[PDB]
Amino acid sequence: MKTILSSETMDIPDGVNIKVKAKQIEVEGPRGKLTRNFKHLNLDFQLIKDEETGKKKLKIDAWFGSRKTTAAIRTALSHVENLITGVTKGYRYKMRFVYAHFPINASISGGNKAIEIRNFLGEKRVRKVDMLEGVTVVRSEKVKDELVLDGNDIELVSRSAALINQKCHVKNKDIRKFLDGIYVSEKGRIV
RNA sequence: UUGAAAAGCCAGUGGCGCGAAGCUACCGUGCGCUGGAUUAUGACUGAACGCCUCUAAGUCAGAAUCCGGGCUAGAAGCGA
Ligand SMILES: [K+]
């Protein structure tokens, strides 16, 4: 019914520098740089500075927006929160090999930017997956048959994990019985 | 049949054997192709709805599919 004003605000930690211009949000922190283009959202992004204290706040509001339009405010706020978390602490995804008979052989290429799977269900085909920008994959030593994906962008790390998972789908078999694959087992922060 | 021999001719291709050349047969030989976008589907982040959610905004993989490329033609189209 076109609510007059829907508004939400988030606090910005002092250790992160943020810039907003034409719905283009730049996020800066010790771990690096992250960028996002929110031009597709018909919202008003404002950065509020408290002169006495100096803490930052990001306010996103929609004027005369419907429920569908208003649903994007929290989405944008969560995206900005994810950017802050990635630039301060980083993101760490953990994947585990599951197999019944044929152990899965993983070969990390140079730079920890690609992986090779060779013995999935005793298959002679070699599966190739390339890590996305800013995401590295390493073989865990303390945990048996575990892959660790680290990066600054949550979306890129999660998409790399999804690519690894989907590259090892079982076919022409009852997947309930044939449970072999590589699956995400834990989502966390590097720091 | 030309007197004979030799050498030809006539029987609309006299008939038979072999027959080069050209034509020609899966009856012979050679060749027949790869970038993008996506369907179904499976997913990422993510609200609505403090949780959840492939979906609402945004995003990914994806086919004997579509488009392009390649191949054939080349317009009251055109260049040097
Ligand atoms: K989800």
TrEMBL record:
Keywords: Ribonucleoprotein, Ribosomal protein. GO terms for biological process: cytoplasmic translation. One of its GO terms (molecular function) is rRNA binding. Residues 12-90, 102-181 form the Large ribosomal subunit protein uL6 alpha-beta domain. This is 60S ribosomal protein L9-1. PANTHER family: 60S RIBOSOMAL PROTEIN L9, 60S/50S RIBOSOMAL PROTEIN L6/L9. The keyword Ribonucleoprotein applies. It holds the Pfam family Ribosomal_L6. Belongs to the universal ribosomal protein uL6 family. Gene3D superfamilies: Ribosomal protein L6, alpha-beta domain. One of its GO terms (cellular component) is cytosolic large ribosomal subunit.
